[PDB]
């Protein structure tokens, strides 16, 4: 159920393939921030989740460097996939920018993104 | 650089290879939690960082399933590599467990881990 | 404004008074977790926000001890009040439980709550 | 144990009084950021912590407005006090700035601060 195209509330698009062994691979296009076009993502998911209706744990990373630009930053999303009629990937994220040691205290933004199969 | 064997303040072991086009691959062994032995990790790093003294942004994920056990959880680490005499990787992390909808509010732990190449 | 009775997506009830000195005071009742009835809260907000359409920054704390129960934990909410026609308070929160030193790595939960007066 | 002056790794100073009723009141001076001089803080703590000597849960808020400046922002710290010879308050924090709705996704910084009774 994870493989495919997902949309979040910001207008971003997350295109992922879930491998049999726990691999996530794909591309991410952000509607906001210091970003243009698609970026490589990689991550992992629980490939033998519980079957009690609980979600499937997963996470992925994007480093915000592609052929077009480099924001000198990286985001990780941690969350879970919930299937069914209203399928969702519910996440929290951490965006770290490369900083000097003196500015390290303000290096990391936190937020939440909910991904759905329709936008 | 980033490639090597790293240890955090909990005694966990992070073995990573940084590929030329931005890939991180390796293994993670946690000294704590519902975990034993090594788990696969993948991630990304900025393969052309700024040259002004800024760190190198990176992140990686571990899903806590291996041949021995499955915690039905995953952790991401977001942070930066800081080079120099004593290299460091400074991170914050999010650990999400699979939950029911009613328990989703308590799905995710947050913390910080600093990694160095110094064995416990 | 901020003063009033607010509810989040979990069904918790946040009753707050915003003082002109930047103080928040009131009570919190959680619909979830190791909690019953009302808990005291205190916090702060920006009492002279920007006039350019930006939200009003705020935060508050609840320690989960009252006359009935003690969870040995505390939550902080950090966020902003958005005054539109349908006012909201959008937050992220940290819940720290008291732990031993060896379990401190797993002391703190993170999440998000959005509050409305509906 | 909590009442007094505390220092973090950034060089900031936290002066707090812990009331019998669970109240934290005091002032905070940040060494970094859009801040000068002292700011009011208020918070809460567990006035009856566990008998097994676990830490004492607590939190507090600073809105970054005083008589000298207004950053249009607020920080909350959530953590625990640990007593004894090397007493500490170990925290994670969230700093939210007032933003437009369009910029709300980048409103909130996260970090960690460890407070000690002696300045590092
Ligand atoms: O500005 C940057 O440094 C790079 C772009 C970051 C976009 C962030 S990642 C978290 C959030 N979710 C999104 O879809 N976009 C923003
Ligand atoms: O308990 C689990 O669900 C799996 C093991 C989690 C271990 C965590 S990941 C964040 C922190 N840093 C570590 O090295 N170990 C813990
Ligand atoms: O379980 C505990 O330790 C005490 C109750 C915590 C309830 C949490 S606070 C964050 C979230 N928002 C709510 O309204 N309730 C939960
Ligand atoms: O820049 C601002 O908006 C106001 C000052 C924020 C300073 C932050 S609060 C978290 C961290 N810990 C500190 O002692 N200082 C920084």
First-to-final CA distance of chain B: 20
Catalogue the E-assigned strands of C1-118.
4-8, 13-18, 23-29, 39-45, 56-65, 70-82, 88-97, 108-116
| Residue among C31, B64, B88, C67 at smallest CA distance from A104 | B88
Please state, in angstroms and rounded to a whole number, the distance separating the CA atoms of residues D59 and D42.
9
CA of A94 vs chain B CAs: smallest distance (Å): 6
Q: Are D14 and D26 in contact (CB under 8 A)?
A: yes
Report, in angstroms and rounded to the nearest whole number, the Rg of chain A calculated over CA atoms.
15
CA of A69 vs chain D CAs: smallest distance (Å): 20
First-to-final CA distance of chain D: 19
Helix, strand or coil for residue D104?
helix
Please state, in angstroms and rounded to a whole number, the distance separating the CA atoms of residues C4 and C47.
16
User: Ligand 3 atom 5: the closest Cα is on which residue?
Assistant: C33
Please state, in angstroms and rounded to a whole number, the distance separating the CA atoms of residues D25 and D47.
14
Please state, in angstroms and rounded to a whole number, the distance separating the CA atoms of residues D48 and D69.
37
SS (H, E, C) D30-79: CCCCCCCCCEEEEEEECCCCCCCCCCEEEEEEEEEECCCCEEEEEEEEEE
Hunting for tokens 């977790």 — which residue is that? C33
Indicate the number of domains in chain D: 1
**Cβ-based neighbour number of residue D65 at 10 Å:** 22
Cβ of B95 below 6 Å from ligand 2: yes
At how many Å resolution was this determined?
Answer: 1.4
Q: Which two tokens stand for residue C98?
A: 């008291």
**Cβ-based neighbour number of residue B21 at 10 Å:** 8
CA C49 to chain centre: 19
CATH number, domain with residue B2 = 2.40.128.30
Please state, in angstroms and rounded to a whole number, the distance separating the CA atoms of residues C78 and C45.
10
Burial D49-62 (b: 16+ CB within 10 A, else e): bbeeebbbbbbbbb
Quick one: DSSP state of residue D85? T
Q: Which two tokens stand for residue B19?
A: 């590929």
Question: Which residues in chain A have their CB less than 8 angstroms from residue B72's CB?
Answer: 46, 49-50, 54, 57
Please state, in angstroms and rounded to a whole number, the distance separating the CA atoms of residues D78 and C107.
10
Question: Which residues in chain A have their CB less than 8 angstroms from residue C111's CB?
Answer: 92, 112
Please state, in angstroms and rounded to a whole number, the distance separating the CA atoms of residues C20 and C10.
29
Question: Structural domain of residue D40, as residue ranges?
Answer: 1-120
Residues 59-88 of A with CB under 8 A from B: 59-65, 70, 72-80, 82
């Amino acid at each position: 159920g994870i493989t495919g195209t997902w949309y979040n509330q910001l207008g971003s698009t997350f295109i992922v393939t879930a491998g049999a062994d726990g691999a996530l691979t794909g591309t991410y296009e952000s509607a906001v921030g210091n970003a243009e076009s698609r970026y490589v993502l990689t991550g992992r998911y629980d490939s033998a989740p519980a079957t009690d209706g609980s979600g499937t744990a997963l996470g992925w990373t994007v480093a915000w460097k592609n052929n077009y630009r480099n924001a000198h930053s990286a985001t990780t999303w941690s969350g879970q996939y919930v299937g069914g009629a209203e399928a969702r990937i519910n996440t929290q994220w951490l965006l770290t920018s490369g900083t000097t040691e003196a500015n390290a205290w303000k290096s990391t933004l936190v937020g939440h993104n909910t991904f759905t199969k329709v936008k």
